[PDB]
Write a protein that binds this ligand. Structure first.
Ligand SMILES: CC1(C)[C@H]2CC=C(C[N+](C)(C)Cc3ccc(-c4ccccc4I)cc3)[C@@H]1C2
Length: 279
């Protein structure tokens, strides 16, 4: 539990600072700056639920079904928001670094509020089912009490497939295309900043892959076990549960790392932070 709490403190501190710095600007904010601020807000909301998940996984849900509905809606909204914002940041980087000559602007701040509102609204509509269905069941298989759905198993499979194909696959493909072309362009440029650019892009892509792929791999394993492709047994189910726990831990680790890998490495944001601390 100590590592859980330590993860909590860093996550709150890191994202809170990023949101604080970006909200201390008296003028327009670049598109990527807006996306980063929204991502920081989403990640703060998402990490607010860490103690709940830890307690639930440790002993049992004891907060009732209403707190389930609220927390599940919170988590789904923030999760989808984080995924889609990480995809939108990469798309903005692509448009600004690959088509840079075709999108030149002589210092007007291109407003991007439309995409942010669309993302948030779509996330809310995606998370809708949590407000209605998520509750607390008394299982007979584990003799425990957790927060789960009450859909038909086919409905559970449909929801899992939707999660897989709208939270991992599409963002991942967008990121891959955008960042691969960014690398391709940067390796054919001339300057002393292309080096750190490629290194940071590669680090970001590797972090995303090796922090998200495990959980969705486990989700696909569960889908397969519910689709008849794999055989259900006590040992396999226990291993799936262990994988669930560890992969969720890794996901929270990524959520805590996000501020470092996206905000604190930029000279712009570091100058902003130092100026704000001076004030
Ligand atoms: C949170 C709750 C209290 C309510 C919502 C779902 C719960 C369980 N569940 C589904 C395990 C949370 C969950 C989901 C996804 C991730 C994750 C995966 C990859 C990358 C980043 C992340 I973040 C981590 C945890 C508990 C009931």
């Amino acid at each position: 539990p100590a590592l859980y709490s330590l993860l909590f403190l860093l996550g709150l501190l890191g994202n809170g600072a990023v949101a604080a710095v970006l909200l201390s600007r008296r003028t327009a904010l670049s598109s990527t700056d807006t996306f980063l601020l929204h991502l920081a807000v989403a990640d703060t909301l998402l990490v607010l639920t860490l103690p709940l998940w830890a307690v639930d996984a440790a002993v049992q849900w004891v907060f009732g079904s209403g707190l389930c509905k609220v927390a599940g809606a919170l988590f789904n909204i923030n999760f989808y928001a984080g995924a889609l914002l990480l995809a939108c940041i990469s798309f903005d980087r692509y448009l600004n670094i690959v088509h840079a000559t075709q999108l030149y602007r002589r210092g007007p701040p291109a407003r991007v509020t439309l995409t942010c509102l669309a993302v948030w609204g779509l996330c809310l509509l995606f998370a809708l089912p949590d407000f209605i269905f998520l509750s607390a069941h008394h299982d007979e298989r584990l003799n425990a009490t957790h927060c789960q759905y009450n859909f038909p198993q086919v409905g559970r499979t449909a929801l899992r497939v939707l999660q897989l194909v709208a939270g991992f696959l599409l963002p991942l493909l967008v990121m891959a295309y955008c960042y691969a072309h960014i690398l391709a362009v940067l390796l054919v440029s001339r300057g002393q900043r292309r080096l750190r650019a490629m290194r940071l892009v590669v680090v970001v892509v590797v972090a995303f892959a090796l922090c998200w792929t495990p959980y969705h791999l486990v989700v696909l394993v569960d889908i397969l076990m519910d689709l008849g492709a794999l055989a259900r047994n006590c040992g396999r189910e226990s291993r799936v549960d262990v994988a669930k726990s560890v992969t969720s831990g890794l996901g929270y680790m990524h959520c805590c790392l996000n501020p470092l890998l996206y905000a604190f490495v930029g000279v712009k944001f570091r100058e902003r932070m130092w100026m704000l601390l001076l004030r």
